[PDB]
Design a protein around this ligand. Structure first.
Ligand code: NA
Length: 220
């Protein structure tokens, strides 16, 4: 595999969004991964509707602003036969009744692929597929105040993840500790968080914060 990958450079990645005060991170991770696999297929990058997932993918196991899973969103899109665009079904950060309209669908998928629980396999997936949906333990003050550099939190758990985000690549930079590898992660807390809304999460450090534990992508 390459030592460095950044799918934003290949046009796979929409700008950073902001979920507000709704527990819908899973919808943003999912749209992020489907935006990538749709681009891969069609060569067109279209922002997808998290509200569509929030309002409508309850039958697949999701619970709106109370939480969800990217794989359940991927299943909804297959079951539903479509997903509306962000422009047509904009984000309101509250759960409402489903207003999906197939005429405004701009995306589809035929299931999803779960990546084996290993950073080595996650790396191979990111290198060959595109942006990957992943779950992390973001429940630490250090994560809130992140500004730059490689994020490493010694109290981070590799099993109890609470936040869906999107790995758009990986790389390295020299550090004091010589723990130099990172996953490049798109968040959904707006541009003012982190590095323009991105975080470099420690890579090949014993599955730091569980980044490889629940990784998947939609099959388009
Ligand atoms: Na922000």
């Amino acid at each position: 595999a390459p030592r460095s990958v950044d799918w934003r450079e290949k046009g796979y990645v929409t700008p950073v969004k902001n979920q507000g005060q709704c527990g819908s991170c899973w919808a943003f991770s999912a749209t992020g991964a489907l935006e990538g696999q749709m681009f891969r297929k069609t060569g067109r990058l279209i922002s997808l509707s998290e509200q569509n997932l929030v309002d409508c993918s309850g039958p697949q196991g999701n619970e709106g602003c109370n939480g969800g899973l990217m794989d359940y969103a991927f299943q909804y899109v297959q079951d539903n036969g479509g997903l509306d665009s962000e422009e047509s079904y904009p984000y309101e950060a509250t759960e409402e009744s489903c207003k999906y309209n197939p005429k405004y669908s701009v995306a589809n998928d035929a299931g999803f692929v779960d990546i084996p629980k290993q950073e080595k396999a996650l790396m191979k997936a990111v290198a060959t597929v595109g942006p990957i949906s992943v779950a992390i333990d973001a429940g630490h003050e250090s994560f809130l105040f992140y500004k730059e550099g490689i994020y490493f939190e010694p109290d981070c758990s590799s099993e109890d993840m609470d936040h869906g985000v999107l790995v758009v690549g990986y790389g390295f930079e020299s550090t004091e500790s010589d723990n130099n590898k990172y996953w490049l992660v798109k968040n959904s807390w707006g541009e003012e968080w982190g590095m323009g809304g991105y975080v470099k999460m420690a890579k090949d450090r014993r599955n730091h914060c569980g980044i490889a534990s629940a990784a998947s992508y939609p099959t388009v």
